[PDB]
């Protein structure tokens, strides 16, 4: 097989530490490299969301 | 309202004037209420109440130990 299954995140971090009164998560697991890459990714996501919205507005709406 | 608005309201206006006294008297009444429930509940609800009481006593003894 060329690819491995995804890592089981529950082994390292539990639901309680993920969110809730006893949550110990304060930073993102994978922070962005820099603000330029962040805004490029968000612009790409906006474009893809608009394309998908048009494609579903063609039929479903 | 947005975010933790009930907590903000408690911070800004407090609670009802007799909240603490009412809560204290209810917690004082809880022992009589538990005894009356044990002697009054019948059937499946009574059996479940007895089973839960046994489990709670076992857990408390384990915590003390």
């Amino acid at each position: 097989a060329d690819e491995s299954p995804k890592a089981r995140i529950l082994d390292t971090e539990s639901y309680a530490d993920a969110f809730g009164p006893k949550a110990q998560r304060k930073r993102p697991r994978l922070a962005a490299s820099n603000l330029e890459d962040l805004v490029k990714a968000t612009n790409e996501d906006i474009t893809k969301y608009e394309e998908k919205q048009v494609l579903d507005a063609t039929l479903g709406l | 309202p947005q975010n933790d608005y009930i907590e903000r309201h408690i911070k800004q206006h407090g609670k009802r004037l007799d909240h603490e006294e009412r809560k204290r008297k209810r917690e004082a009444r809880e022992s009589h209420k538990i005894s009356e429930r044990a002697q009054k509940l019948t059937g499946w609800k009574g059996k479940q109440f007895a089973k839960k009481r046994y489990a709670e006593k076992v857990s408390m003894r384990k915590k003390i130990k």
Partner: protein, 172 residues
């Protein structure tokens, strides 16, 4: 191994002997145990050199030696040790001291490797790999973060030469 018979017994530790290692010049055996201690042994006499190395608050996970080609002549190689407590300790066996105690890992350190370019590579259960500089008072040069789980093991391209030192297959 010539006669397939026992030769020496080393019974200094108190708990399980988790890891053993031989010096790259072949002079001394270093054993790290479950009792959070490290011991050094002369193999020819089957004897213990001084007292145990102490300071780790958890059991030893891996032992590595300083390479012979980086060790200056007239001195003995140093010993890097990792442990469950998340710290890497460097021991000078000549004076039987601890020189550096690196502590950057937030979790248990899986393994430590003393490379051939004067660096140390540590892998730990905090999903990171820390590259420390021995020449700079044990300051972490780099932090590599690309794994989503515990890094169980790490290996270097020159590990065979680092473990073999100056000896070859002819045993000269």
């Amino acid at each position: 191994c010539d006669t397939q018979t026992p030769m020496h017994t080393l019974k200094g530790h108190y708990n399980w002997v988790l890891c053993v290692s031989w010096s790259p010049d072949g002079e001394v055996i270093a054993t790290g145990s479950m009792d959070n201690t490290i011991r050094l042994w002369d193999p020819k006499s089957g004897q213990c050199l001084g007292d145990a190395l102490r300071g780790h608050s958890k059991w030893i996970t891996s032992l590595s030696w300083e390479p012979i080609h980086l060790v200056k002549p007239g001195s003995k190689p140093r010993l890097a040790s990792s442990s469950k407590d998340g710290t890497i300790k460097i021991w000078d066996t000549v004076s039987r001291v601890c020189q550096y105690t690196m502590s950057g890992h937030t979790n248990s350190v899986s393994c430590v490797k003393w490379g051939g370019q004067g660096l140390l590579y540590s892998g730990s259960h905090d999903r990171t790999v820390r590259v420390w500089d021995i020449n700079s008072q044990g300051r972490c040069i780099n932090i590599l973060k690309s794994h989503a789980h515990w890094v169980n093991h790490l290996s270097l391209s020159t590990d065979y030469a680092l473990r073999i030192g100056a000896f070859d297959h002819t045993g000269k």
